[PDB]
């Protein structure tokens, strides 16, 4: 369906870790589970919570970065573009 995407394997593993089921999702669902993954694994900086530290995490491998800021999402969106198969 046009509003769905198919996450590549490593990103799917991350979504499943956060409780997702299945293989295809809407972008809102992907963001929901990726946010949950970051929250429950407590990867965000406790003082500056828009900062996410993921060195050594599969998420860091996907981002090609040790950290990123939710305020400047471009690196996160670049990661999604490379890891979401669309129609």
């Amino acid at each position: 369906q046009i509003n769905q995407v198919r996450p590549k394997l490593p990103l799917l593993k991350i979504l499943h870790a956060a409780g997702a089921q299945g293989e295809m999702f809407t972008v809102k669902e992907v963001m929901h589970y990726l946010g949950q993954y970051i929250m429950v694994k407590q990867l965000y900086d406790q003082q500056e919570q828009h900062m996410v530290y993921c060195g050594g995490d599969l998420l860091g491998e996907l981002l090609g970065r040790q950290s990123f800021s939710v305020k400047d999402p471009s690196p996160l969106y670049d990661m999604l573009r490379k890891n979401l198969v669309t129609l």
């Binding site: 972008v27 809102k28 963001m31 946010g35 970051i38 929250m39 965000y44 919570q49 828009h50 996410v52 939710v70 305020k71 999402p73 996160l76």
Partner: peptide, 12 residues
């Protein structure tokens, strides 16, 4: 000030 506050604004 919270991760969720910032994260939630990435989607409409």
């Amino acid at each position: 000030l919270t991760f969720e506050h910032w994260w939630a604004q990435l989607t409409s």
